[PDB]
């Protein structure tokens, strides 16, 4: 695992075992470490990382951090259980019972409900446990983690906005960045929440989500997702159009859609076209020739 | 420092030591961990994280991994020195001699050369030892890591392209994704290399980087940077315009430039506006009124 | 008119001798008097000499001074001067007012004074006291209308509520025959002005009426459609389509047309269309494009 | 020549009595002769009746049939019929060719035949043998020009290399006065046609000269600029800028102007600009927009 990578990197850079442990451990010890016959401490790994000149996280990854365990395998199975709605039937009953085991499982669990709804598969236990499920996990909370934000995105997917809004408010504003993985998760929520708000025409909530996203850009070391920046700005154009039928705003929205096509993000392009169509219809306003043409197909 | 977070998280989620150590370590020892009196091992933290349901890296990041060691501290000093060119000499004298101690230090070293070049400061040893420095670091190399890609971006900024190209080729194509941090770094090289290629009108090289970037989009679990993807596409639009003077390609590029403005990414926008003005001039083309309105100012 | 002298100028410029012009048409002696401008020339004779010279009949007339000459031209000309210097109004208006029904021309000039007065806020009480009676006197028995009638109608849309004029316009359309470029322009001005007012009052059925009348003109043989009018009217049509079924493409087309007027240098028109679209957009609670608002604002 | 009866129709239409017309111009017995078309009318007399009626002089003439009358007019109409019926060529060219120098109108008509001949690839060997001679005979000692002179030029540009006509055009501009809407059109057509050709031959120096000459026309008193030409000449001005320094904005403007012609329904012009833009693009080794390329091929 880790020790093997250390040896791999060490020799690649032409460093001798000595160069690594010299002032950190015994040569006899460092030997067992590279042999993976002895666990290494986070501290130690951090020192070798500095010694090697190769980023810590990368080393962890090269060692297999990118999957590795139960929850991992279980999480991977969802996209698989997706394509095969038969893989559902069996799996669902193995997860449902342990849905409150950990937040990771509750997310995984919600992953099935999403599939279940998609393939109109009946889930009678869902409607009678979700509420109490949510309370047992969020009634007494102060700090929220990436997994919680992952959970919210999922809830917004298989639950009425009003039934989830309660859980989201306590999560924002965010004031600290805890890594790129964490950064992504906290943006996804806002993107999901904003879309829905725009669609329900709940401008008050839309404005708040737009603001929460903007605030994120002010955090130190934050890693904003360009696609999101692009999509959330599209939703902002729509917001301004809904708020006062600004013509430029509508054009900016349309041009942003066109950019997604140009760069090849077809799924998002489709989504945003159907979205603009559905939005314009409600406002009883016909979208330009370009968009109506696209959506027609 | 990890134990506090583990306790904090365990506490927050309402878990007992039992729920964490059971099947792993003795509650006696586990107490020492949450006490941070006993260094924890990667394998242990990984197990705990799964038990907690909170991502391994989010935990390490909350623990403080974001810098800590002398290499990191030296890294942050680079920006402080950019704002105050006065700090150069004194600090450079400390770094320059250590530029080969490790790949991180060499990278840090290149940052100084960049500061130097910007403020037209004299760094006569650089042209005296750079070629020799590269030979020493990359002659016997067979594989590369994030830091090597970072070093390459650095070199591209303070050295003629031709003196860097050979060092770059053996680094691509990338086959695996080793985390979001590493993913971003492998993408930065391609964006800088492609920009310089376009600017020098080296179409053969420009098209190689465009293809290498596209290849990254096929890698499992790869995390593509939205801003880079939009920017490389702009470079691709320029590429097509230089290849067979297409009007739509020029319009697309200009359009993409415009979206960076609309979404608030002003530095990229300024950068692209300047670049298009120079590209246009070399092709005896007058840029759109708007683009020259920004650059000119 | 100096028709004879123009014939001499042209005849000699083309190297023709007097014989080449008068043989078969009039005696040598009489033709000499014609070129000396001491003998009236008949329309047919001029048309004949015109064909001989190979120079267009109308061009010759114009060169002779039909570009103005008589009492009615002097008066219609006087309007421009009085517009800049309204101190002249009063005394001249006292001469015109009484003669406003002498002919359709004088009536047209008369409305020219009313327009001026409405502008510099001058009091013209006689107007409201006689207008309805004048229009009836001029149009109660009519069956066919002429260019000057369409000029009058246009002048009325300028100093009278739309409704008091509309009923007078309808009987003049549709147009069936073209009677020259001057006539063509005049019959077109009415529609453009009428359609502008119709769109401004969101009167959609009236707007379509005029849009239809204008479009029908394009089916007339030898008609001279005014390009500027075709552009402006088409912009009003784009606005009509937006007002009917909030079509964005129609809104863009209109904005794009306003932009064309800017490019080719028609500022006054560009100016008026920007103001127009700004008011149209407000009533519809739509914020016009960045472009338009920058111009209007300034 | 149906003036007298038109005056009668108009007079009665406006409910005027003969007295109102001839009072102070002629006698009752004479004016009667005038309305029955038994006595020709002088230009001065028609101008006077025209003012009494309040109807425009030129409109009265056109209502009287001034739109044709004489043999030259007949030869003019016969051209359109020959363009569609090429089989009518020979017999009519035999009658016209020998009369091509009878007058400037006949020369213009003759040039019309040559155009039709080139279109349907019909042999006209005399043309190439006599053209230089004809031009020399017609323009060697000329000092001032008329509308028919600019028509001939537009005609020449249509059947003669640009260099054999360039020097014949120069002495005709700048125009200084306007001589009626008909004349106004003709003098603009030359510059529009000349510019188009210059742009296609990439003769930027000449193109600039025509762009300037057109602009000068706008400063002329009472001039009637043709909106379509104004829009099309601005288009050429945009292509000019593009050919001079490859200005991207200029190219976009050219494209936009093409869009406008499509928007307002001028399909012939749209098709033409689409085609010229395609050719000018291919020559500059530049691929035109997605919009035009499709419209062109299809």
CSV table of N, CA and C in Angstrom, one decimal, chain D residues 236-295:
chain,number,residue,atom,x,y,z
D,236,UNK,N,-21.2,47.9,-48.8
D,236,UNK,CA,-20.0,47.9,-49.5
D,236,UNK,C,-18.9,48.6,-48.8
D,237,UNK,N,-19.3,49.7,-48.0
D,237,UNK,CA,-18.4,50.4,-47.3
D,237,UNK,C,-17.8,49.5,-46.1
D,238,UNK,N,-18.6,48.6,-45.7
D,238,UNK,CA,-18.2,47.7,-44.6
D,238,UNK,C,-17.2,46.7,-45.2
D,239,UNK,N,-17.5,46.2,-46.4
D,239,UNK,CA,-16.6,45.3,-47.1
D,239,UNK,C,-15.3,46.0,-47.4
D,240,UNK,N,-15.4,47.2,-47.8
D,240,UNK,CA,-14.2,48.0,-48.1
D,240,UNK,C,-13.2,48.0,-46.9
D,241,UNK,N,-13.8,48.4,-45.7
D,241,UNK,CA,-13.0,48.4,-44.5
D,241,UNK,C,-12.4,47.1,-44.2
D,242,UNK,N,-13.1,46.0,-44.4
D,242,UNK,CA,-12.6,44.7,-44.2
D,242,UNK,C,-11.5,44.3,-45.2
D,243,UNK,N,-11.6,44.8,-46.4
D,243,UNK,CA,-10.5,44.5,-47.4
D,243,UNK,C,-9.3,45.4,-47.1
D,244,UNK,N,-9.5,46.5,-46.5
D,244,UNK,CA,-8.4,47.4,-46.1
D,244,UNK,C,-7.5,47.0,-45.0
D,245,UNK,N,-8.2,46.6,-43.9
D,245,UNK,CA,-7.4,46.2,-42.7
D,245,UNK,C,-8.1,45.0,-42.0
D,246,UNK,N,-8.9,44.2,-42.7
D,246,UNK,CA,-9.6,43.1,-42.2
D,246,UNK,C,-10.2,43.3,-40.8
D,247,UNK,N,-11.0,44.4,-40.7
D,247,UNK,CA,-11.7,44.8,-39.4
D,247,UNK,C,-12.8,43.8,-39.2
D,248,UNK,N,-12.8,43.1,-38.1
D,248,UNK,CA,-13.8,42.1,-37.8
D,248,UNK,C,-15.2,42.7,-37.6
D,249,UNK,N,-15.2,43.9,-37.0
D,249,UNK,CA,-16.5,44.6,-36.8
D,249,UNK,C,-17.2,44.9,-38.1
D,250,UNK,N,-16.3,45.3,-39.1
D,250,UNK,CA,-16.8,45.7,-40.4
D,250,UNK,C,-17.5,44.4,-41.1
D,251,UNK,N,-16.8,43.3,-40.9
D,251,UNK,CA,-17.3,42.1,-41.5
D,251,UNK,C,-18.7,41.7,-40.9
D,252,UNK,N,-18.8,41.9,-39.6
D,252,UNK,CA,-20.0,41.6,-38.9
D,252,UNK,C,-21.1,42.5,-39.3
D,253,UNK,N,-20.7,43.8,-39.6
D,253,UNK,CA,-21.7,44.8,-40.0
D,253,UNK,C,-22.2,44.4,-41.4
D,254,UNK,N,-21.3,44.0,-42.3
D,254,UNK,CA,-21.7,43.6,-43.6
D,254,UNK,C,-22.7,42.5,-43.5
D,255,UNK,N,-22.4,41.5,-42.7
D,255,UNK,CA,-23.3,40.3,-42.5
D,255,UNK,C,-24.6,40.8,-41.9
D,256,UNK,N,-24.6,41.6,-40.9
D,256,UNK,CA,-25.9,42.1,-40.4
D,256,UNK,C,-26.7,42.8,-41.4
D,257,UNK,N,-26.1,43.7,-42.2
D,257,UNK,CA,-26.9,44.4,-43.2
D,257,UNK,C,-27.6,43.4,-44.2
D,258,UNK,N,-26.9,42.3,-44.4
D,258,UNK,CA,-27.5,41.3,-45.3
D,258,UNK,C,-28.7,40.7,-44.6
D,259,UNK,N,-28.6,40.5,-43.3
D,259,UNK,CA,-29.7,40.0,-42.5
D,259,UNK,C,-30.9,40.9,-42.6
D,260,UNK,N,-30.7,42.2,-42.5
D,260,UNK,CA,-31.8,43.2,-42.6
D,260,UNK,C,-32.5,43.1,-43.9
D,261,UNK,N,-31.8,43.0,-45.0
D,261,UNK,CA,-32.5,42.9,-46.3
D,261,UNK,C,-33.4,41.7,-46.3
D,262,UNK,N,-33.0,40.6,-45.6
D,262,UNK,CA,-33.7,39.4,-45.5
D,262,UNK,C,-35.0,39.6,-44.6
D,263,UNK,N,-34.7,40.3,-43.5
D,263,UNK,CA,-35.8,40.6,-42.5
D,263,UNK,C,-36.9,41.4,-43.2
D,264,UNK,N,-36.5,42.5,-43.9
D,264,UNK,CA,-37.6,43.3,-44.5
D,264,UNK,C,-38.1,42.8,-45.8
D,265,UNK,N,-37.7,41.7,-46.3
D,265,UNK,CA,-38.2,41.1,-47.5
D,265,UNK,C,-37.7,41.5,-48.8
D,266,UNK,N,-36.5,42.1,-48.9
D,266,UNK,CA,-35.9,42.4,-50.2
D,266,UNK,C,-35.0,41.2,-50.6
D,267,UNK,N,-35.7,40.1,-51.0
D,267,UNK,CA,-35.0,38.9,-51.4
D,267,UNK,C,-34.0,38.9,-52.5
D,268,UNK,N,-34.2,39.7,-53.5
D,268,UNK,CA,-33.3,39.8,-54.7
D,268,UNK,C,-32.0,40.4,-54.2
D,269,UNK,N,-32.0,41.5,-53.4
D,269,UNK,CA,-30.9,42.1,-52.9
D,269,UNK,C,-30.1,41.2,-51.9
D,270,UNK,N,-30.9,40.5,-51.0
D,270,UNK,CA,-30.3,39.6,-50.1
D,270,UNK,C,-29.5,38.5,-50.8
D,271,UNK,N,-30.2,37.9,-51.8
D,271,UNK,CA,-29.5,36.9,-52.6
D,271,UNK,C,-28.2,37.4,-53.2
D,272,UNK,N,-28.3,38.6,-53.7
D,272,UNK,CA,-27.1,39.2,-54.4
D,272,UNK,C,-26.0,39.5,-53.4
D,273,UNK,N,-26.3,40.1,-52.2
D,273,UNK,CA,-25.2,40.4,-51.3
D,273,UNK,C,-24.7,39.1,-50.7
D,274,UNK,N,-25.5,38.1,-50.5
D,274,UNK,CA,-25.1,36.8,-50.1
D,274,UNK,C,-24.0,36.2,-51.0
D,275,UNK,N,-24.4,36.3,-52.3
D,275,UNK,CA,-23.5,35.8,-53.3
D,275,UNK,C,-22.2,36.6,-53.5
D,276,UNK,N,-22.2,37.9,-53.4
D,276,UNK,CA,-21.0,38.7,-53.5
D,276,UNK,C,-20.1,38.5,-52.3
D,277,UNK,N,-20.8,38.4,-51.2
D,277,UNK,CA,-20.0,38.2,-49.9
D,277,UNK,C,-19.3,36.8,-50.0
D,278,UNK,N,-19.9,35.8,-50.6
D,278,UNK,CA,-19.3,34.5,-50.7
D,278,UNK,C,-18.0,34.6,-51.6
D,279,UNK,N,-18.2,35.3,-52.7
D,279,UNK,CA,-17.1,35.5,-53.6
D,279,UNK,C,-15.9,36.3,-53.0
D,280,UNK,N,-16.3,37.4,-52.4
D,280,UNK,CA,-15.3,38.3,-51.8
D,280,UNK,C,-14.6,37.5,-50.6
D,281,UNK,N,-15.3,36.7,-50.0
D,281,UNK,CA,-14.7,35.9,-48.9
D,281,UNK,C,-13.7,34.9,-49.4
D,282,UNK,N,-14.1,34.0,-50.4
D,282,UNK,CA,-13.3,33.0,-51.0
D,282,UNK,C,-12.0,33.6,-51.5
D,283,UNK,N,-12.1,34.8,-52.0
D,283,UNK,CA,-10.9,35.5,-52.6
D,283,UNK,C,-9.9,36.0,-51.5
D,284,UNK,N,-10.5,36.4,-50.3
D,284,UNK,CA,-9.6,36.8,-49.2
D,284,UNK,C,-9.2,35.5,-48.4
D,285,UNK,N,-9.6,34.4,-48.9
D,285,UNK,CA,-9.3,33.1,-48.3
D,285,UNK,C,-9.9,33.1,-46.9
D,286,UNK,N,-11.2,33.5,-46.8
D,286,UNK,CA,-11.9,33.6,-45.5
D,286,UNK,C,-13.2,32.9,-45.6
D,287,UNK,N,-13.6,32.1,-44.7
D,287,UNK,CA,-14.8,31.4,-44.7
D,287,UNK,C,-15.9,32.2,-44.0
D,288,UNK,N,-17.0,32.5,-44.7
D,288,UNK,CA,-18.1,33.3,-44.2
D,288,UNK,C,-18.9,32.6,-43.1
D,289,UNK,N,-19.7,33.4,-42.3
D,289,UNK,CA,-20.5,32.8,-41.2
D,289,UNK,C,-21.3,31.6,-41.6
D,290,UNK,N,-21.8,31.0,-40.6
D,290,UNK,CA,-22.7,29.8,-40.7
D,290,UNK,C,-24.0,30.2,-41.5
D,291,UNK,N,-24.5,31.3,-41.1
D,291,UNK,CA,-25.7,31.9,-41.7
D,291,UNK,C,-25.7,32.0,-43.2
D,292,UNK,N,-24.7,32.7,-43.7
D,292,UNK,CA,-24.6,32.9,-45.2
D,292,UNK,C,-24.2,31.7,-46.0
D,293,UNK,N,-23.2,30.9,-45.6
D,293,UNK,CA,-22.8,29.7,-46.4
D,293,UNK,C,-24.0,28.8,-46.7
D,294,UNK,N,-24.9,28.6,-45.8
D,294,UNK,CA,-26.0,27.8,-46.0
D,294,UNK,C,-27.0,28.5,-47.0
D,295,UNK,N,-27.3,29.7,-46.8
D,295,UNK,CA,-28.2,30.5,-47.7
D,295,UNK,C,-27.6,30.5,-49.1
